[PDB]
Write a protein that holds these residues in place. Structure first.
Motif, PDB file in Angstrom:
ATOM      1  N   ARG A  84      64.795  70.320  43.445  1.00  0.00           N
ATOM      2  CA  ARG A  84      66.028  70.857  44.418  1.00  0.00           C
ATOM      3  C   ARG A  84      67.016  71.538  44.167  1.00  0.00           C
ATOM      4  N   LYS A 120      57.550  70.960  44.212  1.00  0.00           N
ATOM      5  CA  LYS A 120      58.230  70.302  45.186  1.00  0.00           C
ATOM      6  C   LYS A 120      58.071  68.968  45.074  1.00  0.00           C
ATOM      7  N   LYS A 121      56.998  68.216  44.485  1.00  0.00           N
ATOM      8  CA  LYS A 121      56.935  66.925  44.190  1.00  0.00           C
ATOM      9  C   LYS A 121      58.093  66.431  43.417  1.00  0.00           C
ATOM     10  N   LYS A 149      61.777  65.973  42.826  1.00  0.00           N
ATOM     11  CA  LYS A 149      62.955  66.092  43.589  1.00  0.00           C
ATOM     12  C   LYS A 149      64.042  66.692  42.840  1.00  0.00           C
TER      13      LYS A 149
END
Ligand SMILES: [Cu+2]
Ligand SMILES: [Cu+2]
Ligand SMILES: [O]
Ligand SMILES: [O]
Lengths: 325, 325
Positions: free
Chosen positions: B177, B171-172, B174
């Motif tokens: 996404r 999740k670090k 981006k």
């Protein structure tokens, strides 16, 4: 550095020199006849984004020191016989932007013998709705006891949606309030209005308002209780809460209730400490709280079990919604 | 024999358990006893393509089985297209089936799968056949290493199972996404099938012209780019930057994927400059090529091998640019 420095010849003045170093980067060799940068005035420094990069850098220097101490223990943190049973807020947490005006008359040239005219600036400013904390405590000692209420707002997740541990939250928490209040024996609900925060002060009265009030008193004779305004040092009341998002954001509201007798030893509990003692102290008096600034969040918390086992500490989830225009 | 049911079953069998010798006795018998040169009347070119491939096979010049294959590798592509050329010359299905079975057991599996797919797509003999999804024929090329590892463990322990695929990175990152766009197995099938339908190696001597192929090449990739940017916008990200040969590639990539044979796919660090690639091109060659294409665009004509001009200030100009780009 300040004049309290024990050794300015060796340690210099890192922070103040850095303000000038940054401020002068548009003309570092004086070739262009440029005036000082915004970083070279306290009036203007926070307008520059680099202010916060510089001050995070400085903050991390301090943090290496504060992180060097042993984590607090249960016995360190416990206010024996004082438990926080619940934390809630009366009123939704809502931010918005409103409009504020101030006079530009002092900026313009007048005279001689030519009349003035009203000239104002209108700015949009963050604001929030009033709310009141509801903190239910149980004092299971057979005596009323002075307590310090320490209130922080802490992030739950970062910008990547990652849940933060308490150790990763603590240095990001913002102080919302600190106050001293006698907690009688038994179970009682403490109410504290957002407007009374010791972190914040109201908007300044306008120059025009100060002239009108002073002139009305002088021309006549009237003892106006000027002992009303706070001070000008303190986070503006309107900025107590972060903006948050229209879709809402959840935060941890962290409350630590600590021994007020020990915290205020040497400065009394019933004494008046003004409206801004959390970060701006008490005008002409000693600082009223003996604990390290940031207590109890200023040391490493590698084991969250320690904080969870302390009955006088509690955090709850709160939601803040931004109301756009 | 050449009914849809039999042709489909033949293709199903040829693509089944592609990394092992065929388990179907009828295909085993064909691969053992069929001679691609035994009766060259089965080919529209009287065996020219089969002679080429058999000579490469007999001289031990073909890529071994159990080895990575890349369509962008010139020699490996040439070998796969040698088999496509044979299949493409077959007059009737038994020629197509028997050559496919024979060369399945001789040729690298990646080359074979590629040749069989484009052979089915571009031969009238393939009409009515539905090609299985490549993500079930060569799952390594569509599945991350963690899930493949769980499949290997299931097989080692002789236990069935269904395993959940997650995205790569954390999740670090981006960029994760929008991983659901470029990692979607159907989007990848769309992409490889477009290129199978409209291959850059196509020559009209293979049988038919691919109408407006160069303009469709522009358009399908313009749509991939625009669709990805819509996903970025949907996820609070800015549009992708464009690459340039003289500027850093900001966003690196860890595939966390592996070949069946050949090892793990390589990672690319963040913020790297392009380096010359031995046996491929210098970075400067790419810049020169780019310059020459822009010269044609800004001139309004493409330059032929003998120097004459080919007008591109007309509707086919974009197609001719697709051809040369
Ligand atoms: Cu400063
Ligand atoms: Cu493509
Ligand atoms: O500052
Ligand atoms: O400062």
């Amino acid at each position: 550095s300040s004049m309290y420095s024990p050794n300015a010849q060796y340690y210099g003045s890192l922070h103040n020199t850095a303000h000038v170093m940054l401020g002068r980067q548009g003309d570092p060799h004086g070739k262009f006849n440029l005036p000082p940068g915004v970083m070279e005035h306290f009036e203007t420094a926070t307008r520059d984004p680099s202010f916060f990069r510089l001050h995070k850098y400085m903050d991390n220097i301090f943090k290496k020191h504060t992180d060097s101490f042993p984590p607090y223990t249960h016995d360190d943190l416990e206010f024996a016989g004082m438990v926080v049973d619940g934390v809630a807020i009366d009123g939704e947490l809502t931010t918005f932007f409103d409009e504020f005006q101030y006079s530009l008359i002092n900026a313009v040239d007048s005279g001689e013998s030519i009349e003035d005219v009203e000239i104002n600036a209108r700015v949009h400013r963050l604001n929030h709705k009033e709310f009141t904390y509801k903190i239910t405590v149980s004092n299971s000692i057979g005596s009323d006891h002075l307590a310090t209420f320490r209130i922080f707002l802490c992030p739950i997740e970062d910008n990547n949606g990652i849940t933060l541990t308490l150790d990763k939250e603590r240095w990001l928490c913002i102080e919302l309030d600190k106050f001293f209040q006698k907690v009688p024996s038994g179970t009682h609900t403490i109410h504290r209005s957002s407007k009374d925060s010791s972190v914040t002060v109201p908007d300044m009265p306008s120059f025009h308002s100060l002239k009108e009030q002073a002139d009305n008193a002088v021309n006549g004779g009237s003892d106006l209780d000027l002992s009303a305004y706070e001070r000008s040092c303190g986070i503006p009341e309107r900025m107590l809460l972060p903006k948050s998002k229209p879709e809402g954001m959840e935060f941890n509201l962290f409350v630590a209730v600590t021994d007020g007798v020990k915290d205020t030893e040497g400065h009394n509990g019933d004494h008046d400490h003004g409206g801004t003692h959390a970060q701006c102290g008490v005008h002409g008096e000693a600082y009223p709280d003996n604990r390290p600034l940031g207590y109890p969040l200023e040391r490493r918390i590698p084991d969250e079990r320690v904080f969870d086992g302390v009955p006088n500490i509690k955090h709850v989830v709160v939601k803040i919604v931004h109301h756009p225009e | 024999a050449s009914s849809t049911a039999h042709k489909q079953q033949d293709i199903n069998h040829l693509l089944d358990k592609i990394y092992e010798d065929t388990k179907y006795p009828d295909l085993q018998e064909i691969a053992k006893n069929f001679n691609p040169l035994g009766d060259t009347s089965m080919y529209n070119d009287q065996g020219a393509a089969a002679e080429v491939l058999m000579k490469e096979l007999n001289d031990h010049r073909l890529l071994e089985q159990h080895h990575w294959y890349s369509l962008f590798n010139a020699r490996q592509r040439e070998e796969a297209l040698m088999l496509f050329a044979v299949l493409n010359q077959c007059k009737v299905w038994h020629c197509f089936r028997n050559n496919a079975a024979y060369f399945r057991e001789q040729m690298n599996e990646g080359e074979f799968v590629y040749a069989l797919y484009v052979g089915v797509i571009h031969s009238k003999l393939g009409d009515g056949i539905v090609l299985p999804p490549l993500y079930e024929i060569t799952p390594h090329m569509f599945t991350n290493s963690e899930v493949i590892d769980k499949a290997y463990s299931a097989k080692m322990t002789q236990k069935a199972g269904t395993f959940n695929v997650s995205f790569t990175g954390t999740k670090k990152n981006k960029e994760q996404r929008v991983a659901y766009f470029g990692e979607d197995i159907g989007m990848n099938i769309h992409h490889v099938t477009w290129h199978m339908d409209f291959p850059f190696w196509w020559q009209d001597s293979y049988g038919n012209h691919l109408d407006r192929k160069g303009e469709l090449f522009f358009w399908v990739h313009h749509q991939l780019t625009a669709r990805f940017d819509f996903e970025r916008l949907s996820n609070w990200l800015d549009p992708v930057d464009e690459l340039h040969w003289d500027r850093i590639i900001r966003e690196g990539f860890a595939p966390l994927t592996s070949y069946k044979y050949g090892g793990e796919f390589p990672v690319r660090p963040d913020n790297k400059h392009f380096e010359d690639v031995d046996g491929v091109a210098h970075v400067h060659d790419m810049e020169i090529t780019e310059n020459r294409i822009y010269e044609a665009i800004d001139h309004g004509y493409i330059t032929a091998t003998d120097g004459h001009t080919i007008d591109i200030r007309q509707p086919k100009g974009i197609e001719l640019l697709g051809d040369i780009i």
